[PDB]
Amino acid sequence: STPTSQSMGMQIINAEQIKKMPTGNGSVTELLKNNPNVQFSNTASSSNIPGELAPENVSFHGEKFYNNNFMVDGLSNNNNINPGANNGELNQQPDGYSPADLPAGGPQSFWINSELIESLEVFDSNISAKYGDFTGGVVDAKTMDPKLDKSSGKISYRTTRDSWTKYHISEVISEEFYSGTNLYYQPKFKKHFYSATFNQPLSDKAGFIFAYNRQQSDIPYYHEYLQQWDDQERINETYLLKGTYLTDSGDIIRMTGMYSPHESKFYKKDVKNGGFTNSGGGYRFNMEWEHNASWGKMTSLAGYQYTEDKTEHEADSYQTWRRFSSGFVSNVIDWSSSGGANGQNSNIGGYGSFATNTSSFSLKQDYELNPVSWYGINHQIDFGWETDFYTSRYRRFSDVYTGGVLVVPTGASAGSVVCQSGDELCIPGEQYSRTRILYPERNVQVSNVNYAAYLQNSMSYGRLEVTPGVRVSYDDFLENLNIAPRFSASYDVFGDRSTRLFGGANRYYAGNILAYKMRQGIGSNIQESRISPTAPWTTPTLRTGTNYNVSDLNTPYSDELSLGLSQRVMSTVWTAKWVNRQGKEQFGRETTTIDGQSYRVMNNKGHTEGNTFSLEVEPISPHRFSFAEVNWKLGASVTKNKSNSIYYYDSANQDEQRVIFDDKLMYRGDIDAMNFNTPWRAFLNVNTYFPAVRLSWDQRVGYTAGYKGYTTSSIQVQCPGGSSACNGDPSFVGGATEYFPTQYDDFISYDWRFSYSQPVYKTQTLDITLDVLNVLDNVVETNQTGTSNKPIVIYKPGRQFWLGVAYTW
């Protein structure tokens, strides 16, 4: 029932469109590659990493990728704690690799698959006052719902593998890649994508759906000095149990359980017993009550959500031993974690278990009053409220002792090492730790309430629809009262839907980033020392490490302006919209002094202009022929995005640095956005169904502006006597970092996806499915790294086959 002016600002992708579009894993974000206002993070598709199951990071209209409202069934699917870690780049020491890491499951708590979703509502603009806690878009993943009559269901298996995935990889990383010695170089992998679904009446007005998904990847990893092969394993399970009782009153009570635990078994390079699992996601249970009174509709909701981004290492202490060195060699330590010729250190163990968890109880109530007429205008008064009572908690579960500095008595002194009988930091007759670093059991806790309320009029007269709304909201984290005007108009110009304009002016406010609260003492470690392996641990010496703190902050916001036209040219709807976002008060990092101690502190010093012109052409109805039905959607956009070099909430304000860019001297906040910001796209989905064969051949051909990779100078250009760029400021005596461009060619993306259904008997079908991503196998550049001395280019995947089978009744 969404109104005209807002419907041109949303894209609705139902189960049929999801079955049809060419698909990789089919994360909720991969489905967004048919929205012309979505930019993916440069690395999110990459030949280096075809084993990854995680959501591809998405910017809507140049806003921060962690500032979208990802939703599942109309409830938040967002990480309020650490959503944007490492700018969404695949950091080689995953979060958890070190004892002071605040874990990060990306911006989404639950990683739902395309299998589990019955509609995706992708709101890029003109977004209703119903939706908030974003500066970005909204992606409302309506998961599969009970059917009261069908008794139906599905089982599927989908798979891809290294031998089915052509790799385009740069020569400067090829031997490291094919060695398998790096967590995010994946030359060998297997993916298995299991699912089940049952959709059954308990009684004729009381359906339930049970659904299971199991995205799995196995990925061999090689420790080059420990000389071991270990599988990394990536798993996203999702269990969903949705029930719906349609009462005799016509009011629907819906019970919605979910458990979406995703895990990633990483390892620490050459560390013995060195494995760790970044677990994440968690569970839900909601009750929703859709009441359908004489006034209209009242969708009441209560629900619990739990999220637990957790690292668990395979040990809860960490030791550095020494195999050999000048004047010493050992018989106990039987591995190496280094390659040196004069001496070698050998590492064992890990940093125990630590987690950051949200426990959020949500109340909501959405009202949709029937159209009431006043002063000749019809008013559809939508209104509502929600309250998230939440506790966020980062917490280590056991004291992690770590092995500090090792003393290794040489020659005739070696026999002096006699350990205390319980000691983890001594080896008898070999060596002992002189210092021990305790990362203690800790609990940082923040209990908060976020209130929000809205009114959303949607009101019509004389061919207009005008949809004024507001969305007041208050988080007791920052204590900000945010008032968020939303305006979205439309006019059917020529008496009919064939020619109709629209536009809007909306302020969007984002959710909390609790990372600086959860870190308030992360890296607090107590050092202790001992003179001999029999002596006591003498002197607890706390270092609080890199401290973090909360500060008085405005909420990050995005001022949208939008305008557009929808036109019915000769059997096709052409919808064109411009959208401009002034992302403002966006978070960055600062250092400040409190009670004489230095703290890292969040600031509002970031901003992002993002600008799009987007075009969306589709037919009025599918074409039909003797052979086929053929259906298509030509999306396109031209885009321009900007940033301070405050890339995310941990980035410092490098805005004031001098750089040489576009062949002139300028401040670093005047660079074009390095991530996101491919200039343009033009994608044609065409879908074909051959009734003579039951074969569907669904294909996406998409031309896009080639990546413009920038590499830094290793030495800063002394402006005075260093570059013609210096004419940009002849007063500058200092040095500038130069950026050198490489403009890779504008490229044809081409993905196929076939699916043939075979009736097993009258009620049931077995479907064979075959994606072929990059059917051309073309080399496409997608990121570029480092200085001009080490230009590591990264590419989008080669030809990748995904076979699938789906039995259904």
Residue numbers in the entry: 59 to 867
Task: Give me lines lifted from the publication on this model.
The best-studied member of this class of TBDT is FusA from plant-pathogenic Pectobacterium spp., which functions in concert with the TonB-like protein FusB and the protease FusC to import and cleave plant ferredoxin (10 kDa), thereby releasing iron from this abundant, iron–sulphur cluster-containing host protein. TBDTs are a broad class of nutrient active transporters that couple the proton motive force across the inner membrane with active substrate transport across the OM, via the periplasm spanning TonB protein and inner membrane ExbBD motor complex. A previously reported crystal structure showed that the extracellular loops of FusA are unusually extensive, at least in part to help form a binding site for the large ferredoxin substrate. Here, we show that the addition of LPS facilitated cryoEM structure determination of FusA, a 100 kDa TonB-dependent outer membrane transporter from P. atrosepticum.
Given the specific and apparently strong LPS-FusA interactions indicated by the CG-MD simulations, Ra-LPS and Re-LPS from K12 E. coli were doped into the LDAO micelles of FusA at a 10:1 LPS:protein ratio. The structure of the protein, especially in the plug and transmembrane barrel region, is very similar to the previously solved crystal structure (average RMSD: 1.2 Å). Consistent with these conclusions, non-protein density was observed at a variety of sites around the reconstruction, both in the micelle and interacting with the protein surface. LPS was conservatively assigned if density could be observed for both its acyl chains and adjacent extra-micellar density that could belong to the polysaccharide chain. While extra density, attributable to LPS sugars, was observed binding to the extracellular loops of the protein (glucose sugars in density shown for reference only), the regions of density were disconnected, indicative of stronger binding sites for specific LPS sugars on the protein surface anchoring a more weakly associated polysaccharide in place. However, the assigned LPS density did appear to cluster into four specific regions which were labelled according to the likely interacting β-strands at the membrane interface (β11-13, β14-16, β17-19, β21-β1). In addition, a cluster of acyl chains, without corresponding extra-micellar density, was observed at β2-5. Despite the addition of LPS being required for successful structure determination, no major structural modulation is observed in FusA around the LPS binding sites in comparison to the apo crystal structure.
